[model samples]
Target: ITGTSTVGVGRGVLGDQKNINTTYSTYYYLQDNTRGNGIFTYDAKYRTTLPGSLWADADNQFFASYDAPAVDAHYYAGVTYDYYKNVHNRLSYDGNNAAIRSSVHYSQGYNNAFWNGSQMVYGDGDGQTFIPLSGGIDVVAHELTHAVTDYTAGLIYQNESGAINEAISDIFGTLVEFYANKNPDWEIGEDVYTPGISGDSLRSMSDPAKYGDPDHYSKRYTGTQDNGGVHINSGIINKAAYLISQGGTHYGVSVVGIGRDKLGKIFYRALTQYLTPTSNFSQLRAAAVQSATDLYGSTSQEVASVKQAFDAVGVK
Candidate 1:
């Protein structure tokens, strides 16, 4: 584990050749010390076991086909770390410089990824569905943002709070994508979602309803499944975030765009300051309004736009 940081070139899951951070002692490992103190990625080796082993390459170059996912996982983690640190002035997932860890190639034909409340876990999708989730910068940022939510708002993982949690990840994930300036858009997980399909993503923030998700609170799912529709209902909030950054008319209501940076500043302030574990949709509206007011005076267009966005999505 104690090694000097080095750079390695490799082709990623999506066939993009890029440089990745690696560590070299006797062998090259998927670890980077450039961003903060520690950031590392591991190989799950298509097993259920977590953080399987530190991915090692005999040579300091990672061009093998098997090394694709490892390259993306390690490189994406570093990019996400830098995004949080540079853009937000936050050290890592936690306000403290936490050691970011991730595991790739989790299970065979697996089509999902998650935070697991500790570290990031990526699945090498079932070919037709996904190649490796890490190939999508938005996907990687989405999972890591979960850890950020856990440390800050600690929103409960059910019902309205859970939906808020999901929306927060989607929101920040999109921001990180835009921050990277890599074919950025409001769509989540577009890069690695389905190689066979183009212009389709796991979810769409620009229009959550595009994927049968609720763009308005009136269409929200109140069932007991999916942690009270955490993923499904997240669209309501995601739509509001989208409207805040990019003005849109929804359900006969129009919101004036306030841009992405202000949107992120307000939400980040709300998450770290006003939100609680059980905060509901109405409470989130209040938090956003207050956050915007704090950042840009109560009479500012930012505050008005925040209110309009929430109202447009029927949050209030």
Candidate 2:
């Protein structure tokens, strides 16, 4: 009963109930309204392979939502693939072998999207606030980055390790988004929620200060919500990374600066080349700075920028 569903997850809901649940499923949320009805569309992708789940047909056992065909999934999937290839020069999601399949419209009004060990699961928005978690590239990329977290830096999902996991996602998520050059802002979840929401973005990269949340690490920033709110606390690491490379002031200190893209590359290089599953922030900071120095030399302006950006965010 766990095969693909042939129904439209967004059968109804958009202007009215907005069925945040199925409406924002990857199929609906990520759909390009600029195209047509904004209904989900798909390529001719289907198959029942081992090491994979019976996504659609399976009983309500594991978690299944209707998947629609949409341009967002298609667009981001292709972009993610290329980002890995061109930027990281890896093969696909696996980086070692075959292409990976992404499943959309995972559950009814699930309100969240996640990547299981094998594939991905998405939920329709509650229609009250969020549209669909997968509607944004950053969200999709963020979830997948969780898998990357699992694969590398198997951080204990607590303390600094948890923050590192979240930081990695934001780092790459922003990179993937920037790689396209279509959207150039450094915020996350800006488009997923309604305009009048409280938070500026699901999270802010350029300045956590804009969100009115604490800037530096505090006890409340512990791994609580989902996976220790790795996503929420990620602001700390993300801010640090941003400050280190680009230099900006958040709460008080004068964060030094490194050019944005340059610092991001250093982190990317370290993640793909010199990292293990348990690498924490301290180790990550040391490795990233070292990577920058190796790539640009100690005296290089770019290297200093990289160091400064991290210092600005208080990464140490």
Candidate 3:
């Protein structure tokens, strides 16, 4: 879509008003050219094809019920791009200003979202379990961080490596959420999950066991389901990350809070520099320790908390 870059207003799934970037070439297309190369959003139309149709609006305004998800998907992709570029000094997921694309309304009653090795995909989840997943900034960033992981560490998506991959997504997703400053919490998917229920989330980094996810490596799920319990085991790493930032005592282990800025700097360095595709939990500990060492030296509290957090989580 080639036309003048513009803006559009819309209500999100939560009924919150926000502005989305658009392009007006005959019709307003949800194609934002302001960040990186571009951010393009599409409508999946309740089927599973892909980037179904480029969202086009007649008046350059998106106010209809069906337009909500696309608005957030398009807008949040811009925010995520900005987070990487502004905070991390990375152009995009690929570090090369690659275009970001998203598809909402993926399938009838779909309950998940993911990065499909190329583009982002969001499901208009069944209303009881969830609304549009794109409604959650953390969810959007979580999926986009997968793209970051794929382009950077190339972490293998199985067993311990897979858990690291999942944890990285949660860690950066939460960071991006805090960066956006929209009711930030150490929780995942609370915004769009369980509309009927309140004060809950899909997973908790502060306390993974609240939802049956293991917070320590000893309790890690080793079964084959969920790619060797990638989601379940990621709690170990997530708790470690949380402890590194906020400080907590687990199993007689205590970590001094080093704060979020240092946490992000440490983990970003580890993800981009020290981690490899097959890195395991122990390897992750080494990577984080080295990253902290590189950033703040061996005697710094940043390095100490990095060690204590992993030790608290039984990652040694």
Candidate 4:
């Protein structure tokens, strides 16, 4: 709904206090007009509906304990929008300043969140495996990056292409986390995943093998499960991206760290310009090499590191 922009105070899932952008009309709604066209959040209220009601409160305060997910969803969407716009020069997920929408409290005991083609949906986790997933900035950005991939490469969601799709989300999601400079690490969903277990994450880009994921192409799953192991095979690409940014040795092969900025540049360029819908692991290697060469020249260290990073992960 249309309303005047306002500011509201709220505490996130972890009890961190921050001010969030809101809208004022009938009530203070969790809609931030300052980002993109707008970033609107909704409350699903434990139902499996899409975009329930615009989250609202009587006062400009949102510390009802249940409001934690809505606050994080709205706030994190704005952060992801800023990461793409300020850091990558992309307007929004569609590069057209599209209005961002998200829903929290979706379904009872739901433990996962995803980009549902048009908008983002988050679940109030079972509390054993997770809390409100929106509390993790990387998780929010990871789902949003799926929308980015949808508009750009249109990468098919199966087999090697699907793995690349997942890896791209992980790569950009981690980058956005670093861009925010808030307890940044290479682990995905570390903040809101398994609150009972500290220092555990859904996946680790730096060491996919740490979580039983493949860090090498030879170990990729070739089964018909998980859309041809999209999540499993992504570990290889995630390792490659991690090496490109942080640099490390794996299986006796060493890579030179080129920092996160250039990593983002190369990957963003490859995703937007070089990759196709059905691109596979080999195709991604070529795209990353070519993207780095385009930005830093074929003889440059950046290009060499990009090549070495893929080779280190056995992408060739």
Candidate 5:
């Protein structure tokens, strides 16, 4: 509530210690007023509730095993805030200093995380499938990026537009992982996915086909399931992005690597300036081409790679 912002130490579910921003007003609460409007994290208490209760601690330290999810949720939210602010010069998801909030420990045996239009929600998995999802920074960033997409592009969450929306989230999620320098890779959710299994993730950006996802438009799924395969078809765009950043050959087509920083710049520009609710794959290709032309030139290597990446993925 109303208190001076303070710093506290905590160990996350991953068993690593980090500093968390908290508030002091008799009880140490997980309300950080340091960045923008503020960053607040709540405890869902294993129930289906919105924003639940603001996490509180008697002391300024959080080290209990049960406190793991809250600690990571609070800490990673700050990192994500820093990511957008420093890297993209955006104040918050709205780019207007809107408050960032998250709820953890939501629903017993919940195996997934999502952004429910207002705030971030994390579920504690049933041990076999997933652990607490907030333990993965990419997961946190992925959810937050959804908020960004919601505020900016407003892409309808179905079919090609939805797949673009999903791919944008994955793109920035992995970028934020790289931005934080947390063992960066092209895989999504590797940190908190299937703790029993090593070297696997929910999806792959470099090779979406590894998980039976289409990396080419010719192999796209047209079924109505998964909102027209938003998650499945996202592989095509994600693979194109990966190819643009790190050159690869697919279906005898090659793309010249342009690096991650440029990839982010072009996509961010397109998301905020060009993309719309009903935009499809062909439209997304044009947006990227124009975005690169805006940032780099029409004849720049960045622009050429954007075109080539989309072409290599059969987006034409």
Candidate 6:
């Protein structure tokens, strides 16, 4: 279950994104499509039950399994597992065959999903805005990646450590979504959300500037939303990761990709191999540079470019 879907790691709270072809089966659509019945069914079925597999398909209109949310949970978890294995070579969740538990319909009208120590849980949205937490792979992956952080760094869930934790999930969650597709795009939630809100992705790795003010790290941005800005300051690390992997124009100069896989490898290595429980931004930056240098060498242009990207995002 270490490689299980974040939703699978949780209960059936978010359901499945793949089977939610109409959005009618998701928490986001509870009010309009299911008449608030989706969450009812979800809670009734999953509150006390065990998961069917790492994932499954449910009898309910939404994608759910006898014990979990959707088959997609299995699929996504597989992708995350493969990414770490194939790219980072980290075995599985917790470096072992950790069984992940997932539950759906965690709370009626719940607006968010999160990893609570042992499992993952999603909300049945109010239906006026947002959708089921499982509907977005990035969000699901984000929550699951938190488990990774907990087991590894075990960073205190406050201040910059929390921000780093959030960023790691967002960075890799987006990577999982893209890597799964043969022709991946940077857009998150494009395939899952309705057209009306599809463009309003939770994060913008390609260009955080487009999402809002991710110009630098500041308390103003981190204190505004999403748990001491775990979601907000995440932009700094997310953008840095993106910059390192997919170098962008810096101060009007053009810097570009060294291929996604190489970038991912560098970061993933740094995270799993060098990062520790009490790592801070500066320490992370050094570890990343060292990892790249050690793996690819100091003379490697890719490593230099990646290091530059890190500095552009305030890692110096």
> Which wins on TM-score, candidate 1 or candidate 6?
1
Q: For candidate 4, lDDT tens digit of each residue in 167-218?
A: 9999998999998899999999999999999989999999998999999999
Query: Residue-wise lDDT of candidate 6 within 1-316, one digit each (tens)?
Result: 1111122122333442343211223222211121111111123233434322222233224433433334344345555666666766665567674654445655566666677887666654455455555656676677777888787767656656667777777777878777676335564554344435635665677776676737455423646456566656667777777776777775544445676777677766777778877777777788777878988899887778766776677666
Model 4 vs. true fold: TM:
0.99
Q: How high a TM-score does candidate 6 get?
A: 0.74
- Per-model CA lDDT versus the true structure: 0.90, 0.57, 0.93, 0.94, 0.94, 0.58
Off-target runs (Cα >4 Å) in candidate 1 are none
**Model 2 misses residue 129 by how many Å?**
2.1
> Per-residue lDDT of 161-257 in model 3, one digit per residue for the tens?
9999999999999999999998999999999999999999999999999999999888999999999999999999999999999998999999999
Candidate 4 weakest lDDT stretch, 10 residues: 307-316
TM-score of each: 0.98, 0.72, 0.99, 0.99, 0.99, 0.74
Model 1, span 1-316: residue lDDT tens: 9988888888988788899888999998888888776878888999989978988888877777778888888888888888888878999999898988999889899999999988999999998998888888889998999999999999999999999999999999999989889899999999998889988999999899899999999999999999999999999999999999999888899999999998999998999999999999999999999999989999999999999999999888
lDDT (Cα, tens digit) per residue for candidate 5, span 72-149: 988888898998999899998999999999999999989999999999999999887899999999999999999999
Give candidate 5 regions above 4 Å deviation. none
Better of 2 and 6 by TM-score: 6
Task: Report model 5's TM-score to 2 decimal places.
Answer: 0.99
User: Which pairs of residues have clashing backbones in candidate 1?
Assistant: none
lDDT of 4 at 136: 94
lDDT value, residue 58 of candidate 2:
20
Candidate 2 residue 270 Cα shift, in angstroms, is 1.9
